[PDB]
């Protein structure tokens, strides 16, 4: 991977998380993609979706509300994150090279492009997924909470 | 790429139902739910 354009295919925007706030297998589709999280003034850093955490702060994102967190990390600086500070902006050049330098600076291997190509299709298969099992039920239980 | 959107009864929230789905609302749980108006041209004669 040497290009911020291929990196945007697995870039998770803000309009896609709202559909999967209650879809399970969540720790298996989003873990391996990159989000454009906010720090703040218009600077951004490419953080790594590491684990699925939950905050005790329930915040509303438009119509929907979600109190969960995201285990993100920019190379070595890792902390908790909420689902509102993510940007719909794609991976720019300065932020792509900044993430490249944070990964070369941390000792983390850059994930091979074939991994991104095998990871970007997980999203499209998760979108066209027929919800024939008992996911509607847990979804309503999770929405009413 | 249109998913056939319905409106719940008791919720009034648009749901997406594709075929082979249970008709239930994505929230609160409701088995009755209605369809949205058409997109075709409705023209009347004020008559």
């Amino acid at each position: 991977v040497s290009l911020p354009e291929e990196l945007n295919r697995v870039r998770l925007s803000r309009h896609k998380l709202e559909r999967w706030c209650h879809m399970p297998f969540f720790a298996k589709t989003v873990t391996g993609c990159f989000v454009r999280i906010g720090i703040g003034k218009p600077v951004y850093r490419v953080a790594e979706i590491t684990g699925v955490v939950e905050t005790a702060k329930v915040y509303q994102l438009g119509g929907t509300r979600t109190n969960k967190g995201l285990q993100l990390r920019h190379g070595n600086d890792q902390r908790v994150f909420r689902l509102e500070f993510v940007s719909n902006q794609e991976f720019t050049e300065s932020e792509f090279m900044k993430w490249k330098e944070a990964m070369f600076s941390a000792g983390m291997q850059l994930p091979t492009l074939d991994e991104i190509n095998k990871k970007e299709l997980s999203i499209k298969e998760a979108l066209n997924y027929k919800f024939n099992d008992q996911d509607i039920e847990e979804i309503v239980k999770e929405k009413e909470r | 790429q249109q998913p056939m959107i319905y409106i719940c009864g008791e919720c009034h929230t648009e749901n997406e139902i594709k075929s082979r789905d249970p008709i239930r609302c994505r929230e609160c749980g409701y088995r009755i739910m209605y369809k949205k108006r058409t997109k075709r041209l409705v023209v009347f004669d004020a008559r």
């Binding site: 925007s13 803000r14 999280i37 906010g38 509102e84 719909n88 902006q89 | 249109q2």
Partner: peptide, 17 residues
């Protein structure tokens, strides 16, 4: 109907709170 942002809806920052 996949990502209709058209930018966005004023993305809130982390260092703003």
């Amino acid at each position: 109907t996949s990502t209709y942002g058209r930018y966005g809806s004023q993305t809130p920052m982390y260092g703003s709170g």
